[PDB]
From Swiss-Prot:
Pfam families: Lys. Lysozyme C is capable of both hydrolysis and transglycosylation; it also shows a slight esterase activity. It acts rapidly on both peptide-substituted and unsubstituted peptidoglycan, and slowly on chitin oligosaccharides. It is found in: Secreted. This is Lysozyme C. Monomer. It comes from Gallus gallus (Chicken). Disulfide bonds join 6-127, 30-115, 64-80, 76-94. The gene is LYZ. InterPro entries: Glyco_hydro_22, Glyco_hydro_22_CS, Glyco_hydro_22_lys, Lysozyme-like_dom_sf.
Length: 129
């Protein structure tokens, strides 16, 4: 599924990401835009042989099992393919664990280089939330 910007804001807010560990909603929308372009089906290989899955490009090196990432963990207890569903629940609950693990949203490369320090409120402008 390709979410609309405000559609995604609303689903993320419903799922409790608005100020989750202090990260306002626009942070999560901006990360999603630059990670997946709001596309749940997005997949991208990393240099280390792991793959990133879904709307938040969650990594098989630590968080999910894709059956092909040797020497990795599965800390969200899920197949990586769950992260590609039109429904974002698994991505969001997994996101909550990642962001809670001490490095906050710096876990998302795209967040650190494209959202951090910017006016992320712009990402929810116009949305009914």
């Amino acid at each position: 599924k390709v979410f609309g910007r405000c559609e995604l804001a609303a689903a993320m807010k419903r799922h409790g990401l608005d100020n989750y560990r202090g990260y306002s909603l626009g942070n999560w929308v901006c990360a999603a835009k630059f990670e997946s372009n709001f596309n749940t089906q997005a997949t991208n290989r990393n240099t280390d042989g792991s793959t990133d899955y879904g709307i938040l490009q969650i990594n098989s090196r630590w968080w999910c099992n894709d059956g092909r990432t040797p020497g990795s963990r599965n800390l969200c207890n899920i197949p990586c393919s769950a992260l590609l569903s039109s429904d974002i629940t698994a991505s969001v609950n997994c996101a909550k664990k990642i962001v809670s693990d001490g490095n906050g949203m710096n876990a998302w490369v795209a967040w650190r280089n494209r959202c951090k320090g910017t006016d992320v409120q712009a990402w929810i402008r116009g949305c009914r939330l």
